[PDB]
């Protein structure tokens, strides 16, 4: 899915604009390339270039890496993280949970998505009270079930006013929040 | 706290593409230039002996918009001209800082060399690594205090803290005014800073001796017509239209007594007056400062004169007058 | 509109010296002339406003925050208030031999902050062009130079014109003061005919001052001297801390105590 | 290499004033000209710095029986899907690599500021105080006392242009340019002459250049008065004496410092 | 910074703790007192480690027989290195407070 989206953006002019706006780095299955790309991404975050790191939620990089102040400032989540519905291993794992312990298949699937999203979006608040915003570009997260299964600390901060902001409104509120975060305690 | 009265300051402006974005109510570049005109005029009005220089960086190249000078009007004209600048390209911190370093390297040791980089586009494409240039900056004791826009740049953060300057990011236009007005004042001298005596010259305004007898006609020194009278120099003996100015021959600063006197208030800061809302046995309805009734539950008092000042009186005294009226007595 | 402020230097020592001399000119006539000038200023227009300050060795006090004789009620109130307050101030005054020089500058500061208060309170629709018609009457004090220079620079920044009207003495500090802010400088040698000088040179406001012939400005001697023996010097050796004009090169300036390094 | 010749050719006509003054120093054959200088697209460039492969290809394929339009055409030209991601990763890495090419103050005397550079019995105060206290028991004499017509007229007459307190030519135009040019020449040479004059410079190699410059002062001031003579014999009006003061004061400094050096010796 | 926790007194190296830290410590002490397995969540990536370690050490001092030792597991070795750094800082603080070494051992496999 990441490759398809990247290819579509490349065919259109959005990607060239994105590269001009800020350096762009992408993740690959190979660990060597992943490590090199992340090493350059850190320097970009330090140097004036800045960086947009595209990765996969299930990618080992997402779990291994930790984002701190001036690292992964704004965490963008493109789509609810769901595993493919064809891998037969998950079919056993899921239908057995339905049969025993009485967990609905949809319930467990949404739980597996929300837990993964929280894992991959909760890094920006590592410590030392470093500001940062977590934007989820998916109307599915606006659903009550996803919000309810979301961790309490994020959900309570989340409000109905900004629950389903348009793209432009989200951009404006992000700019304003970054302004407020800028400046001392 | 030791303060460097004489400082050569370079306001590095970036002509980056990101300046095109109209984050502020007007265009970002136009707002920055319009407010920087006020900053320049106020800086000259609060430090006559000091001088300023503007470097505009765009398309990975840095050009000196105006060399070091003591005339605010010339810099103001340069700002007004630059208002129409195309504003396309990418800045280079290495190029801008290298130009500033080249100009400031031969400056006298006693004066404080300072740079204020108004950073707009977070990117910094430079031919050479800037961490190496940071070492040369520290060696040359050139203070660099970046003011970022819509970005907390890491390289500029380390630049500011390592070189001794301060880093800030614009919360809004009102806070931008506050930031630049704060940077107007001379910075305190640190351990690395050193002080040394500087030669100074005080000219006297002169006119025709007696009914244009043995006159001293002359045009100017940096379409000037003939001038019957004007300023002169102890050594150049060359007519100067306006003061203060650096000698075009001697290399010695020509400046009058009032210009020096304008900076004594920096050496003599005014202690903040405690704010007491309640009357506190203050039976004088009329404010001593302005002889006006106190319409608000606020009062200010010194530790010496023990007078009464209203909100406006105290604010004005601490802002502009820089001295307590009654406490002068 | 225009906000005029008359800073009268009513120094009891000098004016009482005149009284003892029994000269034709007297502080009563000076106050009357200032009163007439203020009355004429307000007479110019309704929007125009005025204020008065009197200077004394101890402190400076404001003289200004029906038609018994068929007169504009407002100007009658001005006459009564100024007369009563000036008489009270002159009648009541402590004696201090140590301090006798007149504190002209301290009043200036009061005038400046008063003008700022009025500018804040007045509606933004109408622009106010304030002015300070300083009327000196005695020699200035050396110790007041620094504070007077501070207030002069504040006035320059705040765009107020200090029109000096020194008489019987030429205060170099005051002429320097008005020169900075561009205010006129008139030295009336005929004290009895002082009011004619006010109704011509000082009375016209900055709006019409340019389009009018007035006495040319007096040359200002921007002298400098070293802090040792107090004498004119053309070359000064200032440091980066004191910013003090000195006599000659020294290992360390006394007012600094800095560890100057030779070279 | 003839770097000096190349610089002279570059500035021969680009800047008029610089070459005008440098030539003027030789027009009257004042001094040698050696001391004069002794004392004093975007897309292709971006690709050039971006792709080292393109740099090597350009070096090997330098235009030879081909055309730059064809070279431009050659630019744009799951296996392909992964190639795009790899290409962005490599291209961003290349851009980044190209950008990463290798005291509390204390004082003892503060009243000196209170009385800055500006320069400067007992029963008398009592007498004056009591007399002035008794002065103003009568008020509002404005009706006649404040002013009189005779005094009023005298002030009018004084304010008149011929009166007290009120004291009360651009004919040549072409001479202005000549005077400006001469002043610029004087400034140019005085700059080097005064560059190290104020500093003592008690060194042999440092003092050699001041001696040479001091002789150059004589040599330039030799020719200045001839142009002065040419200008003077026109109308004998609007004397130009300010130029003389600079030369005479420079000579006075030169001779006084020479005497001081001899005294020090 | 000695916190008078409901169960006992617990040392803490940093100057201040947020109310969520108080809640975390009290709930954790409740679980240990019940001596029953439980699960809890804390937002901060860092700070939870120090609070948890301090509470466990204080509980060990109060009831050494109740808990034989602490087995603190982390996802990855690079991450567990930060945990051992936090534990070293806490031990240095406690050692300074006590004035002498105590029979406490802590290590990473
Ligand atoms: Zn000079
Ligand atoms: Zn007040
Ligand atoms: Zn006070
Ligand atoms: Zn001296
Ligand atoms: Zn000093």
Curated annotation (Swiss-Prot), chain A:
It is found in: Nucleus; Cytoplasm, Cytoskeleton, Spindle. Changing residue 132 to W: No longer interacts with GTF2H2/p44, has 5'-3' helicase activity. ISGylated. Changing residue 179 to W: In TTD1; no longer interacts with GTF2H2/p44; has 5'-3' helicase activity. A motif (Nuclear localization signal) lies at residues 139-152. It comes from the Eukaryota. Component of the 7-subunit TFIIH core complex composed of XPB/ERCC3, XPD/ERCC2, GTF2H1, GTF2H2, GTF2H3, GTF2H4 and GTF2H5, which is active in NER. The core complex associates with the 3-subunit CDK-activating kinase (CAK) module composed of CCNH/cyclin H, CDK7 and MNAT1 to form the 10-subunit holoenzyme (holo-TFIIH) active in transcription. Interacts with GTF2H2 (p44) which stimulates the 5'-3' helicase activity of this subunit. Component of the MMXD complex, which includes CIAO1, ERCC2, CIAO2B, MMS19 and SLC25A5. Interacts with CIAO1 and CIAO2B; the interaction WITH CIAO2B is direct. Belongs to the helicase family. RAD3/XPD subfamily. Interacts with GTF2H2/p44 via the C-terminus of this protein; mutations in the C-terminal region of XPD do not alter its helicase activity, but prevent its interaction with and helicase stimulation by GTF2H2/p44. This is General transcription and DNA repair factor IIH helicase subunit XPD. It comes from Homo sapiens (Human). The gene is ERCC2. The chain holds residues 544 to 728 of 760 of the full protein.
Swiss-Prot record, chain B:
One of its GO terms (cellular component) is nucleoplasm. GO terms for molecular function: RNA polymerase II general transcription initiation factor activity; zinc ion binding. Widely expressed, with higher expression in skeletal muscle. The modification Phosphotyrosine is found at residue 43. Residues 8-184 form the VWFA domain. GO terms for biological process: G protein-coupled receptor internalization; nucleotide-excision repair; regulation of transcription by RNA polymerase II; response to UV; transcription by RNA polymerase II; transcription initiation at RNA polymerase II promoter. Keywords: DNA damage, DNA repair, Host-virus interaction, Metal-binding, Nucleus, Phosphoprotein, Transcription, Transcription regulation, Zinc, Zinc-finger. The keyword Transcription applies. It comes from the Eukaryota. A zinc finger (C4-type) spans 233-250. It is found in: Nucleus. Belongs to the GTF2H2 family. Component of the TFIID-containing RNA polymerase II pre-initiation complex that is composed of TBP and at least GTF2A1, GTF2A2, GTF2E1, GTF2E2, GTF2F1, GTF2H2, GTF2H3, GTF2H4, GTF2H5, GTF2B, TCEA1, ERCC2 and ERCC3. Component of the 7-subunit TFIIH core complex composed of XPB/ERCC3, XPD/ERCC2, GTF2H1, GTF2H2, GTF2H3, GTF2H4 and GTF2H5, which is active in NER. The core complex associates with the 3-subunit CDK-activating kinase (CAK) module composed of CCNH/cyclin H, CDK7 and MNAT1 to form the 10-subunit holoenzyme (holo-TFIIH) active in transcription. This is General transcription factor IIH subunit 2. It comes from Homo sapiens. The gene is GTF2H2.
From Swiss-Prot, chain D:
Disulfide bonds: none annotated. Residues 1-40, 41-77 form the BSD domain. It comes from the Eukaryota. (Microbial infection) Upon Rift valley fever virus infection, interacts with NSs leading to ubiquitination by the NSs-FBXO3 E3 ligase and proteasome-dependent degradation. It is found in: Nucleus. Belongs to the TFB1 family. Component of the 7-subunit TFIIH core complex composed of XPB/ERCC3, XPD/ERCC2, GTF2H1, GTF2H2, GTF2H3, GTF2H4 and GTF2H5, which is active in NER. The core complex associates with the 3-subunit CDK-activating kinase (CAK) module composed of CCNH/cyclin H, CDK7 and MNAT1 to form the 10-subunit holoenzyme (holo-TFIIH) active in transcription. Interacts with PUF60. (Microbial infection) Interacts with Rift valley fever virus NSs (via OmegaXaV motif); the interaction leads to TFIIH complex proteasomal degradation. Component of the general transcription and DNA repair factor IIH (TFIIH) core complex, which is involved in general and transcription-coupled nucleotide excision repair (NER) of damaged DNA and, when complexed to CAK, in RNA transcription by RNA polymerase II. In NER, TFIIH acts by opening DNA around the lesion to allow the excision of the damaged oligonucleotide and its replacement by a new DNA fragment. In transcription, TFIIH has an essential role in transcription initiation. The chain holds residues 107 to 547 of 548 of the full protein.
From Swiss-Prot, chain E:
It is found in: Nucleus; Cytoplasm, Cytoskeleton, Spindle. ATP binds at residues 42-49. ISGylated. Disulfide bonds: none annotated. Changing residue 48 to R: Decreased transcriptional activity of the reconstituted TFIIH complex. Damaged DNA opening by TFIIH is impeded. Loss of TFIIH 5'-3' helicase activity, still binds GTF2H2. Component of the 7-subunit TFIIH core complex composed of XPB/ERCC3, XPD/ERCC2, GTF2H1, GTF2H2, GTF2H3, GTF2H4 and GTF2H5, which is active in NER. The core complex associates with the 3-subunit CDK-activating kinase (CAK) module composed of CCNH/cyclin H, CDK7 and MNAT1 to form the 10-subunit holoenzyme (holo-TFIIH) active in transcription. Interacts with GTF2H2 (p44) which stimulates the 5'-3' helicase activity of this subunit. Component of the MMXD complex, which includes CIAO1, ERCC2, CIAO2B, MMS19 and SLC25A5. Interacts with CIAO1 and CIAO2B; the interaction WITH CIAO2B is direct. (Microbial infection) Interacts with Epstein-Barr virus EBNA2. Interacts with GTF2H2/p44 via the C-terminus of this protein; mutations in the C-terminal region of XPD do not alter its helicase activity, but prevent its interaction with and helicase stimulation by GTF2H2/p44. Belongs to the helicase family. RAD3/XPD subfamily. This is General transcription and DNA repair factor IIH helicase subunit XPD. The chain holds residues 1 to 109 of 760 of the full protein.
């Amino acid at each position: 899915y990441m490759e398809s989206t990247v290819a579509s953006w490349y065919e259109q002019g959005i990607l060239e604009n994105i590269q001009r706006n800020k350096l762009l780095f992408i993740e690959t299955q190979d660990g060597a390339e992943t490590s090199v790309a992340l090493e350059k991404y850190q320097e970009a975050c330090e140097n004036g270039r800045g960086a947009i790191l595209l990765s996969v939620a299930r990618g080992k990089v997402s779990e291994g890496i930790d984002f701190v102040h001036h690292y992964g400032r704004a965490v963008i989540m493109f789509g609810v993280p769901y595993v493919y519905t064809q891998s037969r291993i998950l079919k056993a794992r899921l239908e057995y949970l339905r049969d025993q312990f009485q967990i609905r298949e949809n319930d467990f699937l949404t739980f597996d998505a929300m837990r993964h999203a929280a894992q991959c979006v909760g890094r920006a608040i590592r410590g030392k009270t470093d500001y940062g915003l977590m934007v989820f570009a998916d109307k599915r997260f606006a659903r009550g079930d996803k919000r309810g299964k979301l961790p309490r600390w994020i959900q309570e901060h989340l409000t109905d006013a900004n629950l389903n902001l348009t793209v432009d409104e989200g951009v404006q509120v992000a700019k304003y929040f970054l302004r407020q975060m800028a400046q001392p305690f | 706290v030791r303060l460097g009265m004489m400082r050569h300051l370079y306001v590095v402006v970036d002509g980056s593409r990101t300046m095109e974005d109209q984050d502020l109510k007007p265009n970002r570049l136009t707002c920055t230039l319009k407010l920087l005109e006020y900053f320049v005029e106020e800086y000259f009005d609060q430090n006559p002996i000091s001088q300023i220089g503007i470097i505009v960086t765009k398309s990975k190249r840095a050009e000196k918009l105006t060399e070091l000078s003591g005339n605010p009007r010339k810099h103001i004209t340069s700002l007004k001209k630059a208002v129409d600048m195309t504003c396309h390209g990418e800045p280079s911190l290495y190029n801008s800082l290298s130009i500033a370093m080249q100009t400031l390297k031969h400056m006298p040791g006693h004066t404080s060399r300072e740079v204020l980089i108004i950073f707009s586009s977070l990117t910094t494409c430079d031919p050479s690594n800037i961490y190496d240039l940071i070492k040369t900056l520290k060696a040359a004791k050139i203070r660099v205090s970046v003011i970022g826009l819509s970005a907390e740049v890491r390289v500029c953060t380390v630049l500011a803290r390592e070189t001794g300057g301060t880093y800030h990011v614009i919360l809004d236009e009102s806070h931008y005014k506050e930031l630049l007005t704060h940077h107007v004042s001379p910075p305190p001298a640190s351990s690395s800073s050193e002080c040394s005596l500087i030669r100074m010259g005080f000219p006297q305004h002169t006119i025709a001796s007696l009914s244009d007898q043995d006159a001293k006609p002359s045009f100017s020194m940096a379409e000037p017509g003939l001038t019957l009278g004007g300023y002169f120099c102890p050594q150049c003996r060359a007519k100067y239209c306006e003061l203060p100015v650096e000698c075009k021959i001697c290399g010695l600063t020509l400046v009058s007594a009032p210009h020096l006197a304008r900076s004594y208030h920096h050496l003599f800061p005014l202690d903040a007056f405690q704010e007491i809302p309640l009357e506190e046995y203050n039976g004088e309805r009329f404010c001593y400062g302005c002889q006006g009734e106190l319409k608000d539950q606020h009062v200010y008092v010194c530790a010496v004169c023990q007078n009464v000042f209203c909100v406006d009186c105290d604010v004005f005294v601490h802002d502009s007058l820089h001295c307590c009226p009654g406490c002068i007595h | 509109l225009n906000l005029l402020v008359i800073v009268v230097d009513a120094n009891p020592i000098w004016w009482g010296k005149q009284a003892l001399k029994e000269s034709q000119f007297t502080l009563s006539k000076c106050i009357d002339a200032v009163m007439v000038l203020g009355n004429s200023h307000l007479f110019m227009n309704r929007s125009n406003k005025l204020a008065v300050i009197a200077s004394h060795i101890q402190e400076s006090r404001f003289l200004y925050p029906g038609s018994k004789d068929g007169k504009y009620e407002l100007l009658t109130s001005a006459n009564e208030v100024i007369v009563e307050e000036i008489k009270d101030l002159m009648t009541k005054s402590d004696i201090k031999g140590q301090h006798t020089e007149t504190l002209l500058a301290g009043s200036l500061a009061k005038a400046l902050c008063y003008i700022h208060r009025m500018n804040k309170e007045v509606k933004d629709n109408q622009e106010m062009k304030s002015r300070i018609l300083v009327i000196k009457a005695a020699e200035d004090s050396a110790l007041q130079y620094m504070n007077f220079m501070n207030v002069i620079f504040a006035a320059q920044k705040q765009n107020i014109l200090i029109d000096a009207c020194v008489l019987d003495s030429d205060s170099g500090l005051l002429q320097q003061a008005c020169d900075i802010t561009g205010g006129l400088y008139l030295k009336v040698p005929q004290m009895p005919s002082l009011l004619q000088y006010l109704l011509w040179v000082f009375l016209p406001d900055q709006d019409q001052r340019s389009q009018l012939i007035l006495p040319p400005p007096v040359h200002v001697d921007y002298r400098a001297a070293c802090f040792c023996h107090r004498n004119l010097i053309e070359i000064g050796y200032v440091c980066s801390v004191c910013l003090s004009i000195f006599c000659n090169f020294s290992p360390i300036c006394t007012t600094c105590e800095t560890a100057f390094k030779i070279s | 290499a003839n770097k000096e010749l190349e610089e002279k050719n570059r500035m021969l006509q680009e800047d008029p004033v610089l070459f005008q003054l440098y030539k003027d120093l030789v027009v009257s054959q004042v001094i040698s000209a050696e001391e004069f200088w002794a004392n004093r697209s975007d897309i292709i460039e971006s690709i050039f710095r971006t792709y080292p492969a393109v740099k090597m290809k350009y070096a090997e394929n330098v235009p030879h029986n081909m055309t730059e339009k064809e070279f431009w055409t050659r630019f744009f030209q799951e296996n392909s899907n992964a190639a795009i991601i790899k290409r962005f990763n490599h291209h961003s890495a290349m851009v980044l690599a190209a950008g990463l090419r290798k005291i509390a103050l204390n004082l003892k005397k503060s009243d000196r500021y209170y009385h800055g550079p500006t320069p400067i019995t007992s029963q008398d105060i009592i007498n004056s105080f009591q007399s002035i206290r008794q002065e103003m028991e009568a008020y509002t004499p404005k009706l006649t006392q404040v002013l009189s017509s005779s005094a009023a007229s005298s002030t009018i007459t004084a304010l008149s242009p011929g009166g007290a307190l009120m004291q009360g030519q651009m004919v040549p135009n072409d001479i202005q340019s000549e005077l400006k040019h001469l002043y610029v020449a004087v400034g140019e040479l005085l700059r080097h002459f005064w560059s190290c004059f104020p500093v003592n410079t008690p060194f042999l190699e440092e003092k050699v250049v001041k001696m040479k410059s001091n002789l150059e002062r004589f040599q330039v001031t030799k020719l200045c008065p001839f142009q002065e003579k040419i200008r003077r014999q026109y109308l004998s009006t609007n004397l130009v004496s300010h130029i003389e003061e600079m030369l005479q004061t420079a000579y006075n400094k030169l001779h006084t410092w020479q005497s001081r050096r001899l005294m020090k010796k | 910074m000695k916190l008078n926790v409901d169960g006992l007194l617990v040392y803490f190296p940093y100057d201040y703790i947020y109310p969520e830290q108080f809640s975390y410590m009290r709930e954790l002490k409740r679980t240990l007192d019940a001596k029953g397995h439980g699960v809890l969540e804390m937002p901060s990536g860092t700070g939870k480690t120090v609070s948890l370690l301090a509470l466990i050490m204080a509980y060990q001092r109060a009831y050494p027989l109740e808990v034989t030792k602490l087995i603190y597991c982390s996802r990855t070795v690079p991450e567990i290195e930060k945990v051992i750094e936090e534990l070293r800082k806490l031990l240095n603080f406690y050692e300074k407070q006590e004035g002498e070494k105590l029979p406490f051992l802590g290590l990473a496999l």
